[PDB]
Structure formats: structure tokens, C-alpha cells
């Protein structure tokens, strides 16, 4: 068993920026890691390709994963619309942590965020399931288009994504 690695190719108003790859901790949170892995390959017939990062707050995080409404209100899991908080073993310890957005206990869908700082106030409330493995410099580049209120100044999209390993 080896944890899966998936990648996103990021574009800024259609111009390629670069590739970010992620290691998913399927050994600790198998169900949450599976959900993100299948949405990155698009194998259930829907997923992250073509979707955008709709909320980026510099020094905090980049949020995305709404492939239905595209505006921060949608997305769904591969298990139905929402699923349970699998566990909170891992914490939001620094830059590069991959975690699930939600609207309270047991409401995980497809929306996720990549932390650019330690955000310990989300520990025990948001399930951590991966980390940036390569491409942290592309995540830093993405922050330049965010704002204190979250609106981005450019359209940041997942031009392509898939599983590497």
C-alpha cells in the first residue's frame, strides 16, 4: 500500500501556472482520501477538472472544489451529497495541509482548502487528509490573486488533474 499522489495543473485566466501534486493520507483517512482521489480522476463522471478556486485569502488558505454551482455553494461527494467526519487524527500544522471545508459536523462534500499557514483553530472541526508534496511555490503564486475578503482578481482554475500514483 502506498498513499495515492494526485496533481492539479493550475491556470490563471487561461494561462498555465504550473503543477501542484498532493499526497493523500489513505492510510489514516481512507474514505476522505478516496473521495478526493476519485474527484481528481473524474472517474465517477464528475470532478474537479475545469473548476475554480473561488476563495483565496493571502496568509490563510486557497479554497476550491465547487464543480456544480462554481460559486462556493455546491459540489458533492462520491458517496452522495455529504458524508461524515471520518476522524480528526491529523492537525492543521503548517503550510501545505489539505483539509475539507464543511458547514458544521458531518457535512463533507467536495470543497476543500490548502493551508498556507498553521490554522490550529480548525483542528477538530475540519478533517485533514493530505499535504502538498511538490509545487508549494505554485500555491504561493496563487495567493497573489486573493484578497482579505476572499475574492480573487483573476480566474484561477484547475486546468487538468489526475492521479500519478
Amino acid at each position: 500500500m502506498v498513499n495515492p499522489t494526485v496533481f492539479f495543473d493550475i491556470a490563471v485566466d487561461g494561462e498555465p501556472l504550473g503543477r501542484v501534486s498532493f499526497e493523500l493520507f489513505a492510510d489514516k483517512v481512507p474514505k476522505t482520501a478516496e473521495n478526493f482521489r476519485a474527484l481528481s480522476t473524474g472517474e465517477k463522471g464528475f470532478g474537479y477538472k475545469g473548476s475554480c478556486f473561488h476563495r483565496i485569502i493571502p496568509g490563510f488558505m486557497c479554497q476550491g472544489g465547487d464543480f456544480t454551482r462554481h460559486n462556493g455553494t455546491g459540489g458533492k461527494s462520491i458517496y452522495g451529497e455529504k458524508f461524515e467526519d471520518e476522524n480528526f487524527i491529523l492537525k492543521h500544522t503548517g503550510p501545505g495541509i489539505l483539509s475539507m471545508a464543511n458547514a458544521g459536523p458531518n457535512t463533507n462534500g467536495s470543497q476543500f482548502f490548502i493551508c498556507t499557514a498553521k490554522t490550529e483553530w480548525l483542528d477538530g472541526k475540519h478533517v485533514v487528509f493530505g499535504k502538498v508534496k511538490e509545487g508549494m511555490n505554485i500555491v504561493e503564486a496563487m495567493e497573489r490573486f486573493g484578497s482579505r475578503n476572499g475574492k480573487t482578481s483573476k480566474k484561477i482554475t484547475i486546468a487538468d488533474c489526475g492521479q500519478l500514483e
Binding site: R55, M61, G72, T73, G75, S99, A103, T107
Partner: peptide
Amino acid sequence: XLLVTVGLVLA
């Protein structure tokens, strides 16, 4: 504030 929610985004 600094939350990451889906639906009602708070301060």
C-alpha cells in the same frame, strides 16, 4: 474571521 465554510461564509 477566518473560517472555511460552504453555504454561510462567516467573518
